[PDB]
Ligand binder design. Structure first.
Ligand SMILES: [K+]
Ligand SMILES: [K+]
Ligand SMILES: [K+]
Ligand SMILES: [K+]
Ligand SMILES: [K+]
Ligand SMILES: [K+]
Ligand SMILES: [K+]
Ligand SMILES: [K+]
Ligand SMILES: [K+]
Ligand SMILES: [K+]
Ligand SMILES: [K+]
Ligand SMILES: [K+]
Ligand SMILES: [K+]
Ligand SMILES: [K+]
Ligand SMILES: [K+]
Ligand SMILES: [K+]
Ligand SMILES: [K+]
Ligand SMILES: [K+]
Ligand SMILES: [K+]
Ligand SMILES: [K+]
Ligand SMILES: [K+]
Ligand SMILES: [K+]
Ligand SMILES: [Mg+2]
Ligand SMILES: [Mg+2]
Ligand SMILES: [Mg+2]
Ligand SMILES: [Mg+2]
Ligand SMILES: [Mg+2]
Ligand SMILES: [Mg+2]
Ligand SMILES: [Mg+2]
Ligand SMILES: [Mg+2]
Ligand SMILES: [Mg+2]
Ligand SMILES: [Mg+2]
Ligand SMILES: [Mg+2]
Ligand SMILES: [Mg+2]
Ligand SMILES: [Mg+2]
Ligand SMILES: [Mg+2]
Ligand SMILES: [Mg+2]
Ligand SMILES: [Mg+2]
Ligand SMILES: [Mg+2]
Ligand SMILES: [Mg+2]
Ligand SMILES: [Mg+2]
Ligand SMILES: [Mg+2]
Ligand SMILES: [Mg+2]
Ligand SMILES: [Mg+2]
Ligand SMILES: [Mg+2]
Ligand SMILES: [Mg+2]
Ligand SMILES: [Mg+2]
Ligand SMILES: [Mg+2]
Ligand SMILES: [Mg+2]
Ligand SMILES: [Mg+2]
Ligand SMILES: [Mg+2]
Ligand SMILES: [Mg+2]
Ligand SMILES: [Mg+2]
Ligand SMILES: [Mg+2]
Ligand SMILES: [Mg+2]
Ligand SMILES: [Mg+2]
Ligand SMILES: [Mg+2]
Ligand SMILES: [Mg+2]
Ligand SMILES: [Mg+2]
Ligand SMILES: [Mg+2]
Ligand SMILES: [Mg+2]
Ligand SMILES: [Mg+2]
Ligand SMILES: [Mg+2]
Ligand SMILES: [Mg+2]
Ligand SMILES: [Mg+2]
Ligand SMILES: [Mg+2]
Ligand SMILES: [Mg+2]
Ligand SMILES: [Mg+2]
Ligand SMILES: [Mg+2]
Ligand SMILES: [Mg+2]
Ligand SMILES: [Mg+2]
Ligand SMILES: [Mg+2]
Ligand SMILES: [Mg+2]
Ligand SMILES: [Mg+2]
Ligand SMILES: [Mg+2]
Ligand SMILES: [Mg+2]
Ligand SMILES: [Mg+2]
Ligand SMILES: [Mg+2]
Ligand SMILES: [Mg+2]
Ligand SMILES: [Mg+2]
Ligand SMILES: [Mg+2]
Ligand SMILES: [Mg+2]
Ligand SMILES: [Mg+2]
Ligand SMILES: [Mg+2]
Ligand SMILES: [Mg+2]
Ligand SMILES: [Mg+2]
Ligand SMILES: [Mg+2]
Ligand SMILES: [Mg+2]
Ligand SMILES: [Mg+2]
Lengths: 50, 75, 64
RNA sequence: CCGCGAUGGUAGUGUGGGGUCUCCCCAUGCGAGAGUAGG
RNA sequence: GAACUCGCUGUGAAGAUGCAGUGUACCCGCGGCAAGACGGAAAGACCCCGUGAACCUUUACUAUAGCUUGACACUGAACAUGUUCUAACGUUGACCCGUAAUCCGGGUUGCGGACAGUGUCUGGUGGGUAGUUUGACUGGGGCGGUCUCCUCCUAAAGAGUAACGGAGGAGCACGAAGGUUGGCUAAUCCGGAGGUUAGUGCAAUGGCAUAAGCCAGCUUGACUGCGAGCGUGACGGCGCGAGCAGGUGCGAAAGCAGGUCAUAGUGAUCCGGUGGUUCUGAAUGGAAGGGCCAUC
RNA sequence: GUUUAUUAAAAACACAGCACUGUGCAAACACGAAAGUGGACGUAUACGGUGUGACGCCUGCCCGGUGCCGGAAGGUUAAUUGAUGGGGUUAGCGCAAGCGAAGCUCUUGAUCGAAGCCCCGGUAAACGGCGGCCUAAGGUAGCGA
RNA sequence: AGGACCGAACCGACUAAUGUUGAAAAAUUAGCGGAUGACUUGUGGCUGGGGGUGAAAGGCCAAUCAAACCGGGAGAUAGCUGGUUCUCCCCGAAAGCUAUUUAGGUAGCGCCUCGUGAAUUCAUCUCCGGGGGUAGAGCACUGUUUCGGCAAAACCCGAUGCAAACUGCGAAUACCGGAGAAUGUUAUCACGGGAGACACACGGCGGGUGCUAACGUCCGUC
RNA sequence: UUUUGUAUAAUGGGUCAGCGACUUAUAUUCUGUAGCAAGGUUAACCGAAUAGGGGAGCCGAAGGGAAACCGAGUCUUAACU
RNA sequence: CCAUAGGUUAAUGAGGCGAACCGGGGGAACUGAAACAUCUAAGUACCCCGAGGAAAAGAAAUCAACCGAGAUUCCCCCAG
């Protein structure tokens, strides 16, 4: 029932993490500061489709 | 309705008292802290106790609860 | 006649300097989200074929 | 550092041997737990 | 197979002429009888097994002859967005000739007529026909049950250890239920007693007050690259891990943080999809395709 | 009458009779890549297929399932056709980044499109079915250890 | 008149006995059915193998039929059964684990052999350092159990037992590590050439299962 | 012979004589042995030539990396303690 | 109607057989994949037609890689 999602870098590098989410309970977009290894900085990552 | 079991996990003491170990060496695999980490011993996420220094394994019973601690006596 | 290479084996093993074989690790094709980064990181570099398996690989690759 | 305990006997048991062999016994080695005196 | 080929009671691959013990027995035919030589005959037909066969069945799978659909071709002419026409084509109507011929061909004529029919393509139907598949474990097989993973016991105080042995669980959940700092301590009984007898996101076991249980604030370390050393596996693999580099959160700082108290919550390879990429690019520049990294 | 030549002669097969169904003649159907041939020098009082099995009295209810027959509005749907969009290449335009006509080319697949299927009816001497509130309908006549 | 009747020839084949290395690879003997018919028989012809023909038994198609015979593909394939031929010398298994459309097959590992290399490498004993939760024991815990007392018969207390999935205790042994001597043809480990084996059996000890039944069955260990 | 195990009442053989089953080709690896040695060796073919010619090739003397590429290093990574 | 079909005669050639090799028209299955259907066996076996001492192929709408080669056939390499 938890669905796979991409977290996509806001730095425009195309780097992404993957995780899961319960979209029924939590329909709002997951946003987290995560390390982008391309630019080598912590930047905001935002949910997108897998 | 029976007939099931899980794979045996090879837990237990890997290096006994007085054994010379290198840093990183696993001393005990266990479920929870049946043994506790003394001097120069770390505790992994699965409660594995491992040597953080080269030396000899030492088991000891200390504290008010009378708990089994494992330490490394550095060589 | 000439021995035929097992062509599937030639696509998966390469002979090293001292005559061992390197291969790519299994488990890094798909179902990757659930796997820890540590596990995947350790599966990235190539590994050597184990002693038990060398006989099987050598038989498959007579012109390695 | 982390709030009990002899002595003696008993139970068990390694090795060797034996019986009436579901269980015991003998030789030898190891020897509790509980309890008792006491602390 | 060779025999100098008795009975009995035992023994023994467990129903003995051949072993043990013992009893009986002069040597050899002939006629008879069938209790035994697990007598002769036939590499058991029953039964099971082999990833054997054959033939049969069907709403098993995949095909396929046949049947059927339409498109294009052979196939044309007048308006309608209707029919009519004749010249293709059909004729297993008539007559004529080759001809001594109910074949065939040619001719004449009637009828039908761009229809029918055939080719290629195409949807349907298709045990009519064909090739095959139709698991294993199992106190015989079948029926039932089971097949991977976790916990306990069996398990003989290291590890491991079987049975269609005894008992239960999993195929997830959670952007907080994760990280850190500070704060807090239960069940139950009648403010007190009691002390974890509660709690753990979910089985069981081992853990947990320094709490791992529980609350609040601030957060994204549920980081990226690596990794001394070690555990566990036949292997594929799986696990634990200080420390190093970069960048981060919390805290005053020491420090802690590479998910969660731990142990289930899983699927190799192939084939392909998506994004990225100081790689490759079949004359050359590109591109396609391939590689590599991330992911499905 | 027929049958398992060689372990079965029968209650099995056949049978006259009955019914359903196909078939308009270049018949259906069968043998045949085909030409043809059988059906038949027959023509629906005929011919093929299927079931039943002289005769007598009879042959009930169910069309939901599967088949067959009829329908043809609607949905779905092949080849075919190739609208539209996206990409590759490059004449140029740009100081460079890039942009980029025509052509060629890779891809996308609007529109067109029959039968079938879904769908609407019929049909049991079609395959079949014929109850303890439920069904398509609950076994009639006759017969019955 | 008649798929009418009785009955020879003729055509069949219901019963019995015989025969069964036969007189005979289907008959003989005594009886039996049809015997003007959907009869029987001579000669010749036609139908051909997934084919024929069948008043239908899978019957028949040359002593052959759920797919004829002959030749060919052809030495099909056979994880199955059988068999495998002179001599001496040295060493010497396994019947286990893991996986398997696997289970009487096979693969890696274990165990055998040959070669090469290498450490006081290995074993026994003694001493030293270790972790145990078994045997036994026990009843605080988790359950179970009996008696008395006490009392909302609960609870609590005293007394008595029981436990693979109980442990406020806890051996012997076994196992890991260290040190030391003696002994042992390196007995050890690694790498490489060649395997076989993966049906085990009984006996002792510790157990599950079964009835502490089985020359039973399933583990551990000798 | 097959088996846990066979005097076995499990298998096979009436006897004798003759025949009757690990081969052959090519490739590949390891061992022994011989030659030459940082080299070794030629194939087809030519040659009357077991000679001699023929070095096309093949193996080796360098590896690392998917690859470009670098090279006693190289790959990994922004970079390695 | 001309004619054409048709008829008769003459001349010339063919026909049939044969072991392999050769070109062409058709074309299996067992088997292997430890089952099996794609795939394999294999364009093999086999059937058929045609030829010759040989047949077939053959004088680039071929390769190559910016350097060049120069029809076809066969052998050794390239290379499992
Ligand atoms: K260790
Ligand atoms: K005797
Ligand atoms: K007898
Ligand atoms: K006409
Ligand atoms: K037409
Ligand atoms: K069993
Ligand atoms: K049994
Ligand atoms: K850090
Ligand atoms: K009869
Ligand atoms: K109906
Ligand atoms: K363009
Ligand atoms: K046949
Ligand atoms: K094996
Ligand atoms: K060896
Ligand atoms: K035993
Ligand atoms: K046997
Ligand atoms: K026998
Ligand atoms: K060799
Ligand atoms: K050599
Ligand atoms: K290095
Ligand atoms: K096949
Ligand atoms: K096979
Ligand atoms: Mg187990
Ligand atoms: Mg367990
Ligand atoms: Mg990938
Ligand atoms: Mg004492
Ligand atoms: Mg004591
Ligand atoms: Mg006897
Ligand atoms: Mg006599
Ligand atoms: Mg007699
Ligand atoms: Mg017999
Ligand atoms: Mg047999
Ligand atoms: Mg048409
Ligand atoms: Mg069919
Ligand atoms: Mg079939
Ligand atoms: Mg086949
Ligand atoms: Mg089959
Ligand atoms: Mg079975
Ligand atoms: Mg244990
Ligand atoms: Mg033990
Ligand atoms: Mg074992
Ligand atoms: Mg076992
Ligand atoms: Mg088990
Ligand atoms: Mg390391
Ligand atoms: Mg594919
Ligand atoms: Mg190019
Ligand atoms: Mg090109
Ligand atoms: Mg790409
Ligand atoms: Mg009669
Ligand atoms: Mg008969
Ligand atoms: Mg008879
Ligand atoms: Mg006709
Ligand atoms: Mg009837
Ligand atoms: Mg339609
Ligand atoms: Mg009706
Ligand atoms: Mg009635
Ligand atoms: Mg009569
Ligand atoms: Mg007869
Ligand atoms: Mg007679
Ligand atoms: Mg009569
Ligand atoms: Mg008569
Ligand atoms: Mg039958
Ligand atoms: Mg016959
Ligand atoms: Mg057949
Ligand atoms: Mg063959
Ligand atoms: Mg054979
Ligand atoms: Mg010996
Ligand atoms: Mg496993
Ligand atoms: Mg006990
Ligand atoms: Mg216990
Ligand atoms: Mg020792
Ligand atoms: Mg086996
Ligand atoms: Mg076994
Ligand atoms: Mg067994
Ligand atoms: Mg055993
Ligand atoms: Mg026993
Ligand atoms: Mg037994
Ligand atoms: Mg027994
Ligand atoms: Mg036996
Ligand atoms: Mg014997
Ligand atoms: Mg005998
Ligand atoms: Mg015998
Ligand atoms: Mg036998
Ligand atoms: Mg015999
Ligand atoms: Mg290189
Ligand atoms: Mg096969
Ligand atoms: Mg000639
Ligand atoms: Mg020529
Ligand atoms: Mg030029």
């Amino acid at each position: 029932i938890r669905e796979k999602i991409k977290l996509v870098s806001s730095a425009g590098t195309g780097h992404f993490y993957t995780t899961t989410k319960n979209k029924r309970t939590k329909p709002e977009k997951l946003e987290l500061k995560k390390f982008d290894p391309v630019v080598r900085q912590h930047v905001i990552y935002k949910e997108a489709k897998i | 309705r029976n007939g099931r079991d899980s794979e045996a996990k090879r837990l237990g003491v890997k290096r006994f008292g007085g054994e010379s170990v290198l840093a990183g060496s696993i001393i005990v695999r266990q479920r929870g802290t049946k043994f506790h980490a003394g001097a120069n011993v770390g505790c992994g996420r699965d409660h594995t106790l491992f040597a953080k220094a080269d030396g000899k394994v030492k088991f000891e019973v200390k504290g008010p609860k009378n708990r089994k601690f494992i330490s490394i006596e550095a060589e | 006649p000439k021995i035929k290479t097992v062509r599937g084996a030639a696509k998966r093993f390469k002979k090293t300097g001292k005559g061992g074989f390197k291969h790519k690790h299994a488990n890094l094709r798909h179902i990757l989200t659930k796997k820890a980064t540590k596990r995947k990181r350790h599966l990235r570099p190539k590994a050597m074929v184990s002693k038990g398996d060398l006989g099987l690989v050598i038989a498959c690759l007579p012109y390695a």
